């Protein structure tokens, strides 16, 4: 198993509203892994249930899902030990470079679709948190998904949270109606738009969190700026950003989409571009 | 007076973090609580506003509110307050599931109302009012902490307070969730947060247990589609207590009672 005393924090990878992630060294094994600290005050039974539900992540093995070593509760905090991703997350890459190039995004979207279909097919798990900060990259060019809803009790416990700044939630989830992987596809589409353009697209070229939620429930979905992107990419994001879940394209339609096939055929030096833009 | 010399204070084991700072246990002139504020580079305007709030909070002295000793600018930016050995109200209700009798619950409600009435009489809007910021000192005496501090809880766009909401959304009043006004924090928002605390006391559970997403909660509370359902209240809860909690969580801001009215209602309750 894993214990708090076995880790020596090297640096702070980053922090979110829920918690903070530390790049740590596992002394017994000597390998650098990422340790996410999620602070929450919950009952001991809820803690045990969250740990048990997170134990499913041991068989969540995919080239598009970040690795998992273990999870434990130390002191008022849930700690999940996942594989360290040198590239960080796509939010960091967006902070580095003005806008992600379209071909790299094609590669990212292929990775996101493959990870979502892996979770759905072999675990019946919805990501629920497809954000640029929840897609992690490697110095070797891998693209992987993290922070997906494996534990329902953890989701319930994190419902009691502090207010946020932005959101990538589909309108059907905000309105509270039935939601499926179409919600994750809407989130992917919003993330791809936010990474293709140099900004969060909810307020089309600040606004509080409720104003953003109201906009993405009661206003047309955002679209890529025409004239500087290929028609296939625009069509892909438009099919992902459809307010009605039924009209919205599912994973099967996205895979055979013209943009996905174009990007798969294209050869892009993702690792080299990542190293150039992040140093 | 004014700032505290950091050499005098000693930081003991860290306790935890919250919406705007991380709490450390201190030992300055006895046991104190030190919160290192998340603000890295406080603007001179922001720092001066924080020092004015610090003076105002220092002046306060009520049995049901924790003392605000002062601040220190050496250990980054930090605020020193009274340390409470007793557990928080949130831990009692939810984490520890403390079995309170009905009269103990009414007493906690009354003492919280007493402290909040003192704060509002001083023109202090205890934003971020919740079960986390209530401590049951000496077993049952209520202690309200983490009040005011709007200049530090809110990030600052330089000389401009971001003027956006912060803190837990389960207790947040709808009008300040929407942020339709630059100044949505008032006595009535504190009364709504107090009503959510009353709901926790009279149910033993957090509101909106059927919603497991924070953004869904934000949207549905701001749009008026979600309210804490009062069928969850205990059957032995007195009917006028139910009326008070209903009146405190009213969606309309002006419909919510002020804290003298809440105190009068609870005093009527205790005498039955
Ligand atoms: N395995 C990891 N390897 C490297 N960096 C990571 C890893 N996991 C998380 N991070 C970083 O830690 C940051 C904090 O992420 P989270 O704690 O999940 O919250 P978040 O991604 O910021 O999303 P929210 O909405 O703010 S909670 C991310 O933005 C990443 O940059
Ligand atoms: N004066 C205090 N005495 C004892 N424990 C305290 C005190 N103030 C805060 N704490 C504890 O410190 C931890 C974090 O508290 P805070 O930083 O104030 O966050 P919070 O009170 O949960 O919410 P906010 O909105 O940030 S004030 C919790 O475990 C509190 O119980
Ligand atoms: O971390 C989470 N959210 O953080 C960003 C906003 O969602 C998160 C949220 C919900 C959840 C349910 N079960 C685990 N959950 C998470 N943890 C997590 C899970 C798998 C991996 I691999 C890595 C992780 F960090
Ligand atoms: Mg994350
Ligand atoms: Mg507190």
Numbering used by the authors:
A (entry chain B): 62 to 266, 307 to 380
B (entry chain A): 341 to 612
Sentences from the paper on this structure:
In the other there is no-defined orientation with respect to the 14-3-3, allowing reconstruction of the “isolated” CRAF/MEK1 kinase domain module. We refer to this configuration as the “kinase domain open monomer” complex. It appears that the 14-3-3 dimer still associates with the pSer621 site in the C-terminus of CRAF in this state, but due to the highly variable orientation of the 14-3-3 dimer, particles are aligned based on the larger CRAF/MEK1 kinase module, resulting in a 3D reconstruction that reveals only the CRAF and MEK1 kinase domains. The activation loop forms an autoinhibitory turn that locks the C-helix in an outward inactive position. As in BRAF, binding of ATP or a close analog appears to be important for stabilization of this closed, inactive conformation. Key residues that stabilize this state are conserved between CRAF and BRAF, including Val492 and Lys493 in the inhibitory turn (corresponding to Val600 and Lys601 in BRAF) and Phe360 in the P-loop (corresponding to Phe468 in BRAF). Trp342 in our CRAFSSYY structure assumes the corresponding position, and the C-helix and adjacent inhibitory turn portions of the activation segment are clearly resolved. Obviously the dimerization interface is also fully exposed in the CRAF/MEK1 kinase domain open monomer, in which the 14-3-3 has no defined orientation with respect to the kinase domain. We do not ascribe a particular significance to the open monomer state as compared with the kinase domain open monomer; in both the CRD and pSer259 interactions are released and the CRAF kinase domain is exposed for dimerization.
